[PDB]
Amino acid sequence: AKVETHEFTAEISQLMSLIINTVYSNKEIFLRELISNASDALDKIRYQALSDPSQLESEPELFIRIIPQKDQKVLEIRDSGIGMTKADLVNNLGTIAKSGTKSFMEALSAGADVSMIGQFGVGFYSLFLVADHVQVISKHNDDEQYVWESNAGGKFTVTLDETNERLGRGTMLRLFLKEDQLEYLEEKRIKEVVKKHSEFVAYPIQLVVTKEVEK
Ligand SMILES: Nc1nc2sc(CNC3CCN(C[C@](O)(Cn4cncn4)c4ccc(F)cc4F)CC3)cc2n(-c2ccc3c(c2)N(c2ccccc2)CCO3)c1=O
Ligand SMILES: [Mg+2]
């Protein structure tokens, strides 16, 4: 029930500051990056399930689900992948993310397109193109459901999840959209971006749409 605060490594907080402030034109590549991460997490549970089919019982369906929350100015990207333990959420640091972050920043200084972020293994942080803060809700088969939270600053929190829907297994990113990036709540826009950048995905990409029942 305690909110644990942790500090990012310097290189991660440097990267998040660059991304949250960039005026880069093609911000829609965030969604490709998060879909790719979701797909990778799904691949990992599928791989475990091949030897042990009981690892799927926590959530039998393998999906990616996009949930616009228009009233909250939130976009949720959910997967039923392997998920992250509390120790996985606290271990964003001492990771390959450290190696990805410094060389990507150097590449950006040399003129690399921001869309190359995924090639450096740090495409998660592309969410700061469109969002000023994020909650990462995750449930691994070996642990309880936890919430990781960040505002692109130096600090993050990890809290035992007593407030969100149960994932069963997997991860949900809750993006708190910037006031100029509310186009990513619209069905038409999300469909366009998925179709353009995420044609080759092995799992269903489900879009959750809320419409008024009319006369
Ligand atoms: N939707 C998603 N769902 C999943 S689920 C998953 C599991 N990740 C674990 C990582 C540790 N692995 C252990 C391994 O390292 C694998 N290994 C083996 N040999 C080389 N490596 C290892 C090491 C030693 C060993 F003895 C055994 C091992 F298995 C297991 C999978 C990660 C993940 N993200 C994700 C994608 C990209 C990211 C982040 C999260 N970030 C991030 C963001 C916020 C909080 C924490 C983190 C920040 C950077 O980018 C998703 O977005
Ligand atoms: Mg296990």
What are the C-alpha distances in Å from 18 to residues 57, 153, 169, 170? Answer: 41, 11, 32, 29
Ligand closest to 138 (CA) is 1
Task: Put residue 152 in one of left, alpha, beta given phi > 0 → left and psi -120 to 50 → alpha.
Answer: left
Q: Is residue 79 within 6 Å of ligand 1 at its C-beta? A: yes
Q: Please check if 37 is assigned to a binding site.
A: yes
Cα distance between residue 196 and residue 192, in whole Å:
6
| 20 in any annotated domain | yes
What are the C-alpha distances in Å from 55 to residues 48, 109, 172, 208? Answer: 7, 43, 19, 26
Alpha helices in the chain (DSSP H): 10-21, 29-51, 86-90, 96-110, 187-197
Domain span including residue 30: 4-207
Minimal CA–CA distance to 64: which of 171, 182, 176?
171
Measured in Å, residue 141 CA sits from the centre of ligand 2 at: 6
Q: Please check if 178 is assigned to a binding site.
A: no
Minimal CA–CA distance to 72: which of 179, 176, 167?
176
- Which 3 state secondary structure label does DSSP give 80? coil
- Report phi then psi at 156, rounded to 5: -135, 165
| 113 in any annotated domain | yes
CATH code, domain with 126: 3.30.565.10
Residue type, 108: L
| 215 in any annotated domain | no
| 213 in any annotated domain | no
CA torsion, points 147, 30, 169, 74, in degrees to nearest 10?
50
Q: Please check if 52 is assigned to a binding site.
A: no
Q: Which atom of ligand 1 is nearest to the CA of 89?
A: 46
Cα distance between residue 17 and residue 32, in whole Å:
21
Measured in Å, residue 35 CA sits from the centre of ligand 2 at: 25
| 199 in any annotated domain | yes
Minimum CA distance residue for ligand 1 atom 37: 124
Cα distance between residue 11 and residue 8, in whole Å:
8
Alpha helices in 52-95 (DSSP H): 86-90
Number of domains in the chain: 1
Residues 6+ apart with CB under 8 A from 58: 139, 141, 168, 169
Minimum CA distance residue for ligand 1 atom 7: 84
Q: Is residue 134 within 6 Å of ligand 1 at its C-beta? A: no
Minimal CA–CA distance to 169: which of 50, 27, 63?
63
Other Cβ atoms less than 10 A from the Cβ of 63: the count is 16
Q: Which atom of ligand 1 is nearest to the CA of 140?
A: 5
Q: Please check if 200 is assigned to a binding site.
A: no
Cα distance between residue 205 and residue 62, in whole Å:
10
Cα of first residue to Cα of last residue in the chain, in angstroms, is: 46
| 212 in any annotated domain | no
| 214 in any annotated domain | no
Ligand closest to 128 (CA) is 1
Q: Is residue 68 within 6 Å of ligand 1 at its C-beta? A: no
| 147 in any annotated domain | yes
How was this structure determined? It was done by X-ray
Measured in Å, residue 88 CA sits from the centre of ligand 1 at: 7
